[PDB]
C-alpha cells in the first residue's frame, strides 16, 4: 500500500510494520557498546604495562 | 515523488534501489557478528585460565 | 506530509530529517572501524606466538 510520512527531529527511523522505528535500536546500541568500547579501556592497562615489556628486553 | 514500503510482519526494511532490503543484511550478520561475539567466547577461557593467574600469587 | 524518494544507484539510505542518509553512517565504518578490524591484526601476532606457547609445552 502506501504509508509516506516521517517524524523530522534530526533522529533516523526504519521501515519497520509500516512504523518508524529508531534505527539505532536495530543496531543493538545500548547494549552491546561495551565490547565494542571495552578494547579502549582495557588497552589502556595494556598498554601501560609495557614498562615490564621494555625492562625485561634491556634487563 | 514516493515509492512502496514493505510488508508488515515484524520485519524492518531499508530504501535501497527502490525496493525493501533487510538492514541485517547491511549489519552483515554472521560476516562480523564473530568478532562482535568471539571475544564472550574466547574470555570464558581466559576467564577460567585465571587458575593459574592467581596461583603465582598465592604461590 | 510525505517522503522524497532518495536515489536509485545501488545505495541505501535511512529516514533522517526527511532526507535520505547513508544508513552506513549508523553502522560505524569511518575513524573507529579500525578498533572494530584491529583485534583482526593483532590477533595475528598473538596467533603466531603460540610457537611460545607448545616449545615451553613440549620443552
Given at each position: ?14 521501515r519497520?510494520?509500516?512504523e ?5 535500536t536495530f543496531?543493538?546500541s545500548?547494549?552491546?557498546?561495551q ?7 582495557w ?6 604495562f609495557?614498562?615490564t ?7
Open positions: 500500500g502506501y504509508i509516506p510520512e516521517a517524524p523530522r527531529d534530526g533522529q533516523a527511523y526504519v519497520k510494520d509500516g518508524w522505528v529508531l534505527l539505532s543496531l543493538g545500548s547494549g552491546n557498546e565490547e565494542l568500547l571495552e578494547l579502549d579501556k588497552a589502556s592497562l595494556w598498554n601501560w609495557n614498562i615489556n621494555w625492562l625485561w628486553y634491556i634487563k
